[PDB]
Specification:
By secondary structure, the protein is of the alpha+beta class. The chain is built from three helices and five strands. It has one domain: Ubiquitin-like (UB roll). Bound molecules: FE2/S2 (inorganic) cluster. The PDB classes it as electron transport.
Length: 106
């Protein structure tokens, strides 16, 4: 799947994430996950605070109730379609997904 990561400084990094892989898995491989995953990707923290283009949020597997509670624990401003990276599974059909990462993810 074509995955685009929009950093805070504006630098964009695009990777290929295979089916069943989490945007978090491909990030650690392209040097993008340097967000110090607290739960280590076990979906138990809010360090993976990112913004998924509202166009893939209602398409990729609806975030689980564990993310909603961790989403209220983020350090930056939440968005109506705000999402995390360790609870989303990429797929070829959803290729073109745009992920927006802020300057405050803690
Ligand atoms: S990396 Fe910990 S909740 Fe996503």
């Amino acid at each position: 799947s074509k995955v685009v990561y929009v950093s805070h400084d504006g630098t964009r990094r695009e990777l290929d994430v295979a089916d069943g892989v989490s945007l978090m898995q491909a990030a650690v491989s392209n040097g993008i996950y340097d967000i110090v995953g607290d739960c280590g990707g076990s979906a138990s923290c809010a360090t993976c605070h990112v913004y998924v283009n509202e166009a893939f949020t209602d398409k990729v597997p609806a975030a689980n109730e564990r993310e909603i509670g961790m989403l209220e624990c983020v350090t930056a401003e939440l968005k109506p379609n705000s999402r995390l990276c360790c609870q989303i599974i990429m797929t070829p059909e959803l290729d073109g997904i745009v992920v927006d990462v802020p300057d405050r993810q803690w």
